[PDB]
Amino acid sequence: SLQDAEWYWGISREEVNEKLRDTADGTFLVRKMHGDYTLTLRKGGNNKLIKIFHRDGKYGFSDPLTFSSVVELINHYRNESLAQYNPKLDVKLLYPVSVVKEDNIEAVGKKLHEYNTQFQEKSREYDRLYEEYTRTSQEIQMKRTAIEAFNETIKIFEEQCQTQERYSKEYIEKFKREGNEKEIQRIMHNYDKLKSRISEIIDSRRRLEEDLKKQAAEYREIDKRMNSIKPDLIQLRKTRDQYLMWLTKKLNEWL
Amino acid sequence: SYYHHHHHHDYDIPMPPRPSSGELWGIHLMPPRILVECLLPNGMIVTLECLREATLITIKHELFKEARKYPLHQLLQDESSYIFVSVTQEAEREEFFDETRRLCDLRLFQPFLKVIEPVGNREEKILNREIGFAIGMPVCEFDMVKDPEVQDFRRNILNVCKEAVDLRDLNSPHSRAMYVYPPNVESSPELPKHIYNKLDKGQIIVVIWVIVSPNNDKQKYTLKINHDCVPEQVIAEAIRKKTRSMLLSSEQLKLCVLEYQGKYILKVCGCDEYFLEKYPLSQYKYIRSCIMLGRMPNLMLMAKESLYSQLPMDCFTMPSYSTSTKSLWVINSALRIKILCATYVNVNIRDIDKIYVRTGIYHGGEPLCDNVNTQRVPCSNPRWNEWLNYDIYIPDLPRAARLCLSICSVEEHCPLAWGNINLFDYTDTLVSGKMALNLWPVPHGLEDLLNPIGVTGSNPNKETPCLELEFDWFSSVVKFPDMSVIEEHANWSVSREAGFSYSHAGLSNDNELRENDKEQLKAISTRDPLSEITEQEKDFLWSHRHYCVTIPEILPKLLLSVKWNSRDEVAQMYCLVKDWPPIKPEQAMELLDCNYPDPMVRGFAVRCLEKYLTDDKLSQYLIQLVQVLKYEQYLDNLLVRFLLKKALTNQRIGHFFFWHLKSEMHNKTVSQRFGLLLESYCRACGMYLKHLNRQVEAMEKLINLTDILKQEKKDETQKVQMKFLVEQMRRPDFMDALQGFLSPLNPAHQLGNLRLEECRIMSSAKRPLWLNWENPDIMSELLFQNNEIIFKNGDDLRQDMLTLQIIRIMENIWQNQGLDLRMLPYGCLSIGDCVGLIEVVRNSHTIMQIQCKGGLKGALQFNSHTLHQWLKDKNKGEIYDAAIDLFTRSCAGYCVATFILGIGDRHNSNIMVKDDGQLFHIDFGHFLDHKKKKFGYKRERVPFVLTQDFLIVISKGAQECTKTREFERFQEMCYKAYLAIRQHANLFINLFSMMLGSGMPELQSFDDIAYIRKTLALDKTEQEALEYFMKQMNDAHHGGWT
């Protein structure tokens, strides 16, 4: 029971944290020459490491050593808070945590491949979409600056048909008779080119704006679907961890 | 029978290029002949048909001929009284001053020009365009930023610029020369044993070259001097030999030597490198290379005035852009924050039950219990109007406190978006009122609910989850206390501790401390930053903080022991850090990673650098120092001011500083910050801007060219693509843009004319360009006549860049500890979003190529000996013995590095060998076993598994190579190397920690970096780690290692 305690794993610093990763406040487990064992507790997305020292029979954190075992010391603190030991540890040891029962061994191993294939298929779908997202962010903001540039282009052209109206209609009254229909037709020709060109430009900006909404539309749909893939991708990953624990080289075939 | 007749009804049978354009909107390459509308001052639109490649000089000159044919000509002035303006692809109205610029290089939006008389009479000043070309955004886009922090950054940074410009023009022209051509020098003058044994009782033969007339003939003066003798001494002996004569006495010689001596300086023949200060010749990098490679130095005597002729005047010019309040410690409440509404949450209502907002106060680690709000109105129009209540009193909020939040889904816990926000602003002001916070999407790696490493501030992208919220109001702007005030609170708390009872000091906290404890601290100090400290150790370290000043290097550990939610403790820590002994830069750099956000701590870190970090050592670690800018809270800070001044002080750093910032300009988490910094540099760097603008223009051309190949000239034979390539490189604008410039891989290398006959597209699907330039140096021949580099649009180069940097550093550690393992960290440089330059190593081939070319007609199996045969063919005689030594030494280094780093699996097409016998790896892929993310599970893989081929070469042709002295020697290199890197394992952890900022999927959190702990066996003893490494190496090879 000392070794067959559910929460006693006996593992390196790294694979503790990967087992503590993404669990809630209060979750725990227990773990070289510095002391003996280590209570690695999780608190609000951060791992607190608490040393267990063993000397003349007793086990404990520091001075109040009157606990005759490793399995003794944890049962007390699963009920009670750690604040009285060290002031700012107002959190209990609440989640002392450590799938088909396919006692078949080989059939658990096959399921590990099925889930790991699904997971891997899932991770690509997520990666595909993340890149579509980030492209689409770029393609949108280029669409936006294009609209600005369009709008600034138009201002320059609107200004142009204004700029000519000053000087072109200064020329009508300053002469009129000399090149009446001759000079004014060929000034009218320019003006009607200039305004139809503004008309083409405005129609070009418009046509981009309708594409921008359809882009911004697709962008939402990508995000939507990312957010629906994400929680599946966790639970699929989390089942794969539990199957791979329950088993434990040969594996690398199933993965 | 194959698939149990199971139909997949779903299945229908019906390089990564990102989408950036150039030349003209929506079109990579403008048509060779194009119509451009010219808008005249008289309101007429004459349309010209212009050549794509035509200068504005030409287009103006033709416009004013063709204007005459249209009405109202007599209202036009002479053509000289006018300038072209148009709307560019960045949506700004750019006046085209440099009329030698070509139509295809203006980055127009639509093909049209407008004729105006030039406003902003200071034309000088509206060559800001230069700056914003270099940067990749217009300078005017900053001027219209509301944010006072930004506008304050721009105004206040000029201090640094003005000061640096003053250091340049101090002993001018020498100091200008010294800025532009700083000496390329190793850190240590002490020469490793193995280098000192290659030369002749401490002496080198050197070759000094000289010119008289008409610059065609040149003259050797083969010296033989002591290695440690300075450039001046070497200039004398050259001039002695040069001017000894039968018609000159001895006396008359010495007098002619003094008049000539200091008129000259020493150049490296073949590249722009010089020896302009008193260091041993051995300490310059060129020399020490020449020693190692078995080469005779070719320097040049250069007239100082011909050098100072080529320097230009900087002409720095200041740009146009030139109280009583409540102490935080008066505020008598707990912290509360009101979460209001989130507007843009994109969620399937069928998939999602409901969502809430997670929050936490942070310091990189959390100052209180994390807390959430109720799950309200789930996915549809989520609004909560809750005050979240945080158990921390306002006065205990530390200077670098941050609120980190996320919108989550429901144990179905899962994050949708996230954002962080500094509880104090840049003016020390506690944040009060309402805030809009546009959120970031959850990245690849992070599954966690919150993201405190992530960048502080709101996502600049509008169309994203905007979660708006409200911070309390204490009828006053609250400010953070002065240091004077914090110092008194500390002096108070100290004496207050002295009077506490002995009874009470029996919880977690004498004048003389135990000898067992005095030695437990020094053991803690030696641990790597990833060996997490326990709550007992924290309390322990804290309690002996005053002894900890005796062990300066403990500081990183001490700081994580402080309770940052107790202003009592922090205020005292502030007084320790005030005058804690400086520590080595390799250790101080840890304190600029994300774990240490406090301003006083980071200031101390910068104070360490300011003392110790040499310009050599800075430019080695420049990548990490630029990245670390991400974790600074505000724009103006000490680190930025340190780095900026160095960049403006030393043009070699300044170069790589520009490119590393410029590189990341697409990444919207840093664009504004880096853009702002880039502006400062560009404004103050001097003539180098004009040089950088040419590098910058060359790369934009390569980007557009490869963009076309990758997108429109696919499904076309190599033959067809290669024709298109060559065709385009012959156009005048490409000739212009791609010929007269400095290589970004090393600006000492000038790139001259293109040799298009040697330029090609490589076989890869990414369509890399292999490019070749004539080295236009006078002594090209003495170094290399051609200079060739690979431009690759497609792959993200920065993983490789990091790997190569790590390799560069491993070598230096090894070598400078006297043990000769020869790595080849070829040059890699990202300059963009998945765009880069790779240095070509000539005379090297992949193993695969070596195996073909020596493979018999009948393909019955490739011979293990052909590598060895190929190597013998290249190295005959006594040359052979050292070619195997090289291969054995290089193969051992790359074995250890590779294993420690956990790189992509090696095989015949990513392993390369040089004619001289040097082995080196390329294309590393993913660097900390990132494909273990799929399964991994503690793989601890050997990526370089020496097949027979390699072993045969190592043990010169013997059968059963496993059992030779050749291979015993090899193993003892590998064991000695592995241990050497293991003793510098702090450094490598910190280098990887500093790269968490960058958006590299391989580096998302500190447990990505945890691989390097396993592979270096840091938890174990060194003896066990030797045995661990052996075990690892034995099992991968199946025998050999005990």
Ligand SMILES: Nc1nc2ccccc2[nH]1
């Ligand atoms: N010294 C040095 N540092 C570098 C960083 C990137 C590319 C080339 C480099 N050479």
